[PDB]
Chain A
Amino acid sequence: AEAPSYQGPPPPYPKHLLH
């Protein structure tokens, strides 16, 4: 009778694209 909890954020911005 309860909905599944909120999944959370999507995958983080690609780390190999930062620097």
Chain B
Amino acid sequence: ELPLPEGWEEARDFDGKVYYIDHRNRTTSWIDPRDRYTKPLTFADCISDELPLGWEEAYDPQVGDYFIDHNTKTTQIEDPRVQWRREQEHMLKDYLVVAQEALSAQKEIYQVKQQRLELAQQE
């Protein structure tokens, strides 16, 4: 419920799709000029359902729901919020594996130090 920045006009397509008119710069964009200030800038900053700036959900009667990335002028069927999710899941899993490996290497060192200490007692 935040107003449009001055010089901006909301408008519609022949198809009814909303877009925005910048009268100061005399240009048009698919991106609501308020998105700057209200939306997450990255998938990381996303909460809940949110899509980051420049992204949009769309429906196609043949193929179903998909995603539009205005930042790179591309489209995809796979949910970008879910690809990001999994990705961060995969990073954590592999990190705990590296951590377990480092810790286990240190376990070997101490056990070896321990045997060598005992061998010195014998001798």
Contact = CB atoms under 8 A, between A and B. Distances in A.
Given A6-B73, A10-B19, A13-B21, A1 B63 contact: yes
A19 B66 CA distance: 40
Given A10-B29, A11-B13, A12-B28, A4 B19 contact: no
Q: Report, as a range, how many residues of chain A touch the other chain.
A: 10 to 19
B75 interface: yes
B13 A10 contact: yes
15 contacts: A2-B63, A3-B60, A3-B75, A3-B77, A4-B63, A4-B66, A5-B75, A6-B75, A7-B68, A9-B28, A10-B17, A10-B28, A13-B21, A13-B22, A17-B26
